[PDB]
Amino acid sequence: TCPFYKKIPGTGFTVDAFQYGVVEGCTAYFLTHFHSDHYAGLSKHFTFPVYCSEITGNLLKNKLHVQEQYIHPLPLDTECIVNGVKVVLLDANHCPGAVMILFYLPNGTVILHTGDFRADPSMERSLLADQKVHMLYLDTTYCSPEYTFPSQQEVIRFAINTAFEAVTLNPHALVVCGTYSIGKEKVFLAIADVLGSKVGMSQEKYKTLQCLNIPEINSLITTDMCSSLVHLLPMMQINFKGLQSHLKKCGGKYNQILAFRPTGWTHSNKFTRIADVIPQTKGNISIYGIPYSEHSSYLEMKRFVQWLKPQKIIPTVNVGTWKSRSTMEKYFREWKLEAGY
Ligand code: NI
Numbered sequence: 001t002c003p004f005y006k007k008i009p010g011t012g013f014t015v016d017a018f019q020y021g022v023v024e025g026c027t028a029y030f031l032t033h034f035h036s037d038h039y040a041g042l043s044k045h046f047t048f049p050v051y052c053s054e055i056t057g058n059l060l061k062n063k064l065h066v067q068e069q070y071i072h073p074l075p076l077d078t079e080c081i082v083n084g085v086k087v088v089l090l091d092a093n094h095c096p097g098a099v100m101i102l103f104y105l106p107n108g109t110v111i112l113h114t115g116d117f118r119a120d121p122s123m124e125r126s127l128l129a130d131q132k133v134h135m136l137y138l139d140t141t142y143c144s145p146e147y148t149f150p151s152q153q154e155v156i157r158f159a160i161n162t163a164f165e166a167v168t169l170n171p172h173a174l175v176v177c178g179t180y181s182i183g184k185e186k187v188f189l190a191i192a193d194v195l196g197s198k199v200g201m202s203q204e205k206y207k208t209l210q211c212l213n214i215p216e217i218n219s220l221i222t223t224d225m226c227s228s229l230v231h232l233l234p235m236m237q238i239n240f241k242g243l244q245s246h247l248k249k250c251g252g253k254y255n256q257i258l259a260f261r262p263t264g265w266t267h268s269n270k271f272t273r274i275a276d277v278i279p280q281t282k283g284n285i286s287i288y289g290i291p292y293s294e295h296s297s298y299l300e301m302k303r304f305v306q307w308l309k310p311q312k313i314i315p316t317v318n319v320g321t322w323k324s325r326s327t328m329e330k331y332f333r334e335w336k337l338e339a340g341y
Helices: 054-062 121-125 152-169 185-195 203-210 240-248 298-308 322-339
Strands: 013-015 028-030 050-052 071-073 080-082 085-091 099-104 110-113 135-138 173-179 230-234 256-263 280-282 285-291 312-315
Touching: 050 054, 054 071, 054 203, 121 298, 135 298, 152 173, 152 185, 152 256, 152 285, 173 185, 173 240, 185 230, 185 256, 230 240, 240 256, 240 285, 298 322, 312 322
Parallel strands: 013 028, 028 050, 050 071, 110 135, 135 312, 173 230, 173 256, 256 285
Antiparallel strands: 080 085, 085 099, 099 110, 280 285
């Protein structure tokens, strides 16, 4: 059974609600992004209308085989009428194709569903500038002040400088980057660009990346592993055993691995600055954990909410424990008393 924070009142609509069977009263199922916790339940046998971005709809068709007649792609930043209700899709600054959804209800209520997002001051100059929001369905993944991390631009600067230095010292070093979902593509693209290489990967990953509308992608990626000195591997393989095994397969082309694991936040962020980050090393293999987040930090979330001034907030993450719920409600009241809404 579908929980309340996935239903949009006054509509036939649900958001990210595919694992509950047929939802009573639902005439259109919105999907904010192609991450498995959110699409859980969709397959080629799905027969109700799905509304999404173009990039999400390419993934639904090619990766999950949803039939085309049920995929309804909408352009971003454009007022659209769906089943008699005005909606807009906005870029969420999450993974490729990820959207927030603005719903203009028939009674005059305006609702923003953020999906998963990384709040940014640029969102203060989107179509949100123009009008009031009564209800905010908020991605609260890192809603506590202990959650700090650097900008994506600082993290990429660290990765590129670390990879360029290592491979210039040792031309026979291979770089490996872990992945397990879409998102975070700038990590491996930025490293391969500084090295003058294509990125090498499995056929399954190449297929996924070909659905993402990245400009000049054919110039950046390949399935010919022998031609490339930046390889992608599943995230589960980014450990000393899996990397040793990979280096064997490379026919004596390389004598060292430098590997990256993009994570979200980890507790070493409470102590260590990005510039001071060091790897774990075993012989000729080194592994860097880098805190590349596609969700809001606490401070980014607080800024966005204090700017938007919603009348009511419904969290969509960390909703399963009383302690998490109580914590989040305390911070929403702090924010509201501090800003005066
Ligand atoms: Ni996500």
